[PDB]
Design a protein around this ligand. Structure first.
Ligand code: HEM
Ligand SMILES: CCCCCC/C=C\CCCCCCCC(=O)O
Length: 454
């Protein structure tokens, strides 16, 4: 039975555009979905897409025989500086399958065991800063969490030291990154983008792109002048299928790609986790009993991090409520029918809105806004395609196990060494630069006086 598709109100030539006049576009689209349900069309001048929210319809869009990965308007604007690297290439470009095969070995169990000692070095530098603050003083949470995650990928991936804890303002690569992502998001809401009114926005965009690339030159110069790491395989590895290596131009696009996607989403996860623990004290208490029982030595081991079983349940429930890269896009390979009721033509686009999928009552029950880590107690026992914070199929996230090992280690050392206080009674305010993070979150931390090691 062929249905007409739902759609919000239109305004002559403007289409649906005056319904997103905001710096928080994903939060606004969540409100249109609660009003119309599992599927709606959305139009702006020149272009069209379709937003999906239920488990039954997202199960079908994830069939790789019928639909593949699409570049959204948002990733087309980022491609202006990340090129044909892993995150912004089409699946049919020569460099996608090639880079994939050449770089996959850097994420194996052997290599993970080899990164552990470098992760502890940055972790110790964070506990030392908080042990040395005076009693009149407080902590800025998302700012210190991005100091730890940028330095950690710098050392493990490239053997370079950004030294972010020897500065009291943010690193200069960070300042230009955050104005570039912001500009790309603002571009999406303009009617006529060519006018002389947007000439200065365009010139500032080029200045932030040159700042990022100046850092790439610096890393290339240090390896030259100087390992079995990510940079090693970029300069020497060969694709077992075609026998080719990567050219110079593609290699620069991969440095930029791994520095940005390799820290920004991990910082965001650690900030939401601490926010939910200080607003739920029966949950905080229990996660602290685990850290004190399991971590009996002066610095943590690789095998001990694997035993921190409840701290992992906490991290997954934080990603269910606020997944830190909150959408991904798809296109139809040939004419087809979706759900048994909506015909589609070769080429039309679809968009998975991840925070709505994670509030489907037919799958999780009627209490979807509560914070309850115990949902994840026997995981093999939750349906397939209900939980997707890392994407789908052959284009899923390559860094999944890296991030989760980093986060479980750092959160357990935080809970062993300090008690925390919500001193300003903080109200949640979520900032959007394509990705998500809580703005202005601040705390106080009192030390339990327990010594560190070497
Ligand atoms: C919890 C933190 C993280 C989250 C939530 C996350 C999420 C994602 C998502 C949603 C995609 C798919 C996007 C799409 O289909 O358009 C993706 C792909 C990717 N991710 Fe992550 N990520 C995280 C951490 C990392 C880390 C630590 C690295 C690197 C060390 C990384 C590197 C990449 C790369 C290179 C791709 C492109 C894969 C390909 O298409 O070949 N991410 N990630
Ligand atoms: C390497 C570059 C970093 C990639 C950062 C972006 C990742 C997540 C993209 C989510 C896009 C959400 C678009 C919302 C706006 C709209 O639909 O109008």
């Amino acid at each position: 039975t062929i249905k007409e598709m739902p759609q919000p109100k239109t305004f002559g030539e403007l289409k649906n555009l005056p319904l997103l006049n905001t710096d928080k576009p994903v939060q606004a689209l969540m409100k249109i979905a609660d009003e119309l349900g599992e599927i709606f069309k959305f139009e702006a001048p020149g272009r069209v897409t379709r937003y999906l929210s239920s488990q039954r319809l997202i199960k079908e869009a994830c069939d790789e025989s019928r639909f593949d990965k699409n570049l959204s308007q948002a990733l087309k604007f980022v491609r202006d500086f990340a090129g044909d690297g892993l995150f912004t290439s089409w699946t049919h470009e020569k460099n996608w399958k090639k880079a994939h095969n050449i770089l996959l070995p850097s994420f194996s169990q052997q290599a993970m065991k080899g990164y552990h000692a470098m992760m502890v070095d940055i972790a110790v530098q964070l506990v030392q800063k908080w042990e040395r603050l005076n009693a009149d003083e407080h902590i800025e949470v998302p700012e210190d969490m991005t100091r730890l995650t940028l330095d950690t990928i710098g050392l493990c991936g490239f053997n370079y030291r950004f030294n972010s804890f020897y500065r009291d303002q943010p690193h200069p690569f960070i300042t230009s990154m955050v104005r570039a992502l912001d500009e790309a998001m603002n571009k999406l809401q303009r009617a006529n983008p060519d006018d002389p009114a947007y000439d200065e926005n365009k010139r500032q965009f080029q200045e932030d792109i040159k700042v990022m690339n100046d850092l790439v030159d610096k890393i290339i110069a240090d390896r030259k002048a100087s390992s079995d790491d990510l940079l090693t395989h970029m300069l020497n590895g060969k694709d077992p299928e075609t026998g080719e290596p990567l050219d110079d131009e593609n290699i620069r696009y991969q440095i930029i790609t791994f520095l940005i996607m390799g820290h920004e989403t991990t910082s965001g996860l650690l900030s939401f986790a601490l926010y939910f623990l200080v607003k739920n004290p029966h949950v905080l208490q229990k996660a602290a009993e685990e850290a004190a029982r399991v971590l009996v030595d002066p610095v943590p081991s690789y095998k001990q991090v694997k035993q921190l079983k409840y701290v992992g349940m906490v991290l997954n429930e934080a990603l269910r409520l606020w997944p830190t890269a909150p959408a991904f896009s798809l296109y139809a390979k040939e004419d087809t029918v979706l759900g048994g009721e909506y015909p589609l033509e070769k080429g039309d686009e679809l968009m998975v809105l991840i925070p709505q999928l994670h509030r489907d009552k037919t799958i999780w029950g009627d209490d979807v806004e509560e914070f309850r880590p115990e949902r994840f107690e026997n995981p093999s026992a939750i349906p397939q395609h209900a939980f997707k914070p890392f994407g789908n199929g052959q284009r899923a996230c390559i860094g999944q196990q890296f991030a989760l090992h980093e986060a479980t280690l750092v959160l357990g050392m935080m809970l062993k060494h300090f008690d925390f206080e919500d001193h300003t009674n903080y109200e949640l305010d979520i900032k959007e630069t394509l990705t998500l993070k809580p703005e202005g979150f601040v705390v106080k931390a009192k030390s339990k006086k327990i010594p560190l090691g070497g």
